[PDB]
């Protein structure tokens, strides 16, 4: 068995509504579960009753945690939190074998943050410090970890759709993926922000600027489950995937999210959608490489039980490009912060049909990629 077994099978996600690791809180212990999340930087959890909320961190009976005098206030693309800082001792049962003191938002009152079924009570932020709440100053959890302990600085995610996978910490497991892991650079340690170079729709090149696909930057978060574009990308990739899936037509509110198409169970016809390529910045100049995926990515099941149904899950976004949950589904991503890296490589997990798989593939030559990037 690999060295790393005892975090493999580590997360869990209760219909598609986010993958959480278990965490371990405070003395005597409180276990609760933790939202993984790459696109922010706070570890936050529910501390006081919630109707959505199984359990919540009892502050008053953890004898080791102290208050940092300090409230704090997080909003995000959805639904927002506020409460209180402080700190107190964390591990990672079905993580490294290390406990380390970090700060702790006790989530005291929120809106549209928590999700009903979901099963998880709190949030870790695993991107960096520029991007903390109230400001950079507030060490995020996996800077503590690394300057506590000598757990190499690096973390791996396979998230494993229709719902569980495995959050390797310190390591990567080379049973969560098949072929090679290919790298792009980290831009800018604030977010997890990379550069994308070209977009294919069907092996049909959209044929945009590359700088419109990272505008104003392109970003890879766990925490949104779609794959979110840019306007004038979001409104030209629509165009192209339904040329390409013309041997049928679907309500133009199916493109938006808000309608849902079903299909008899075990019947959908995955061969009429196509494949997605987003081209990537390599490590070397002057090449990329790409990762493809397939519409059991981008169409996203919604749980009669007969009955298939599906949300279309690539969207519009103000903000940049984010890499979801669509994209991460496909792939084993490492997070290599040592070497200011993102590796993607085909995951042992990804669903997929007797005729198509997901891919990373390379290297490809494209010129130019330093332009790309907003500044
Ligand atoms: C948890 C759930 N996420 C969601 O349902 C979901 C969450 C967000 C969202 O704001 N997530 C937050 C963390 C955050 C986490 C939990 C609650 C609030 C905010 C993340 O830090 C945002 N990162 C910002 C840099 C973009 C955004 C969206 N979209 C706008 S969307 C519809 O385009 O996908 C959906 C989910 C479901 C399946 C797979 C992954 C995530
Ligand atoms: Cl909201
Ligand atoms: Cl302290
Ligand atoms: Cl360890
Ligand atoms: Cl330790
Ligand atoms: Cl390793
Ligand atoms: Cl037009
Ligand atoms: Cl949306
Ligand atoms: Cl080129």
């Not at 339904?242 to 199916?254: I, L, R, V, Y």
């Not at 009429?272 to 099941?301: A, C, D």
Request: hydrophobic content about 35%.
């Amino acid at each position: 068995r690999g060295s790393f077994v005892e975090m493999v099978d580590n997360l869990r996600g209760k219909s598609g509504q986010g993958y959480y690791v278990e965490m371990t809180v405070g003395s005597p212990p409180q276990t609760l579960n933790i939202l993984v999340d790459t696109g922010s930087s706070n570890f936050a959890v529910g501390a006081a009753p919630h109707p959505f909320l199984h359990r919540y961190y009892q502050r008053q009976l953890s004898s080791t945690y102290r208050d940092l005098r300090k409230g704090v206030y997080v909003p995000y693309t959805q639904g927002a939190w506020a409460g209180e800082l402080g700190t107190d001792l964390v591990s990672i049962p079905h993580g490294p074998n290390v406990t380390v003191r970090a700060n702790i938002a006790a989530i005291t009152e929120s809106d549209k943050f928590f999700i009903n079924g979901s099963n998880w009570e709190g949030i870790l932020g695993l991107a960096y410090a520029e991007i903390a709440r109230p400001d950079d100053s507030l060490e995020p959890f996996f800077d503590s970890l690394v300057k506590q302990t000598h757990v190499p600085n690096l973390f791996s995610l396979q998230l494993c759709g229709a719902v569980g996978g495995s959050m390797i910490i310190g390591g990567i497991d080379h049973s969560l993926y098949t072929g090679s892991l290919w790298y792009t650079p980290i831009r800018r340690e604030w977010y997890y922000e990379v550069i994308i170079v070209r977009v294919e729709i069907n092996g049909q090149d959209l044929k945009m600027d590359c700088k419109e696909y990272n505008y104003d930057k392109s970003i890879v978060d766990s925490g949104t489950t779609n794959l979110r574009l840019p306007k004038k990308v979001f409104e030209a990739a629509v165009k192209s995937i339904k040329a390409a899936s013309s041997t049928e037509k679907f309500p133009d509110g199916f493109w938006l999210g808000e309608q849902l198409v079903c299909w008899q169970a075990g019947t959908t016809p995955w061969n009429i959608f196509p494949v997605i390529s987003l081209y990537l910045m390599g490590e070397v100049t002057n090449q990329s490489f790409r990762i493809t995926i397939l519409p059991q990515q981008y169409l996203r099941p919604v749980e009669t039980s007969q009955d298939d149904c599906y949300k279309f899950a690539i969207s519009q976004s103000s903000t940049g490009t984010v890499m979801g949950a669509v994209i991460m589904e496909g792939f084993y991503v490492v997070f290599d912060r040592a070497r200011k890296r993102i590796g993607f490589a085909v995951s042992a997990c990804h669903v997929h049909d007797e005729f198509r798989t997901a891919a990373v593939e390379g290297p490809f030559v494209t010129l130019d990629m330093e332009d790309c990037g907003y500044n």
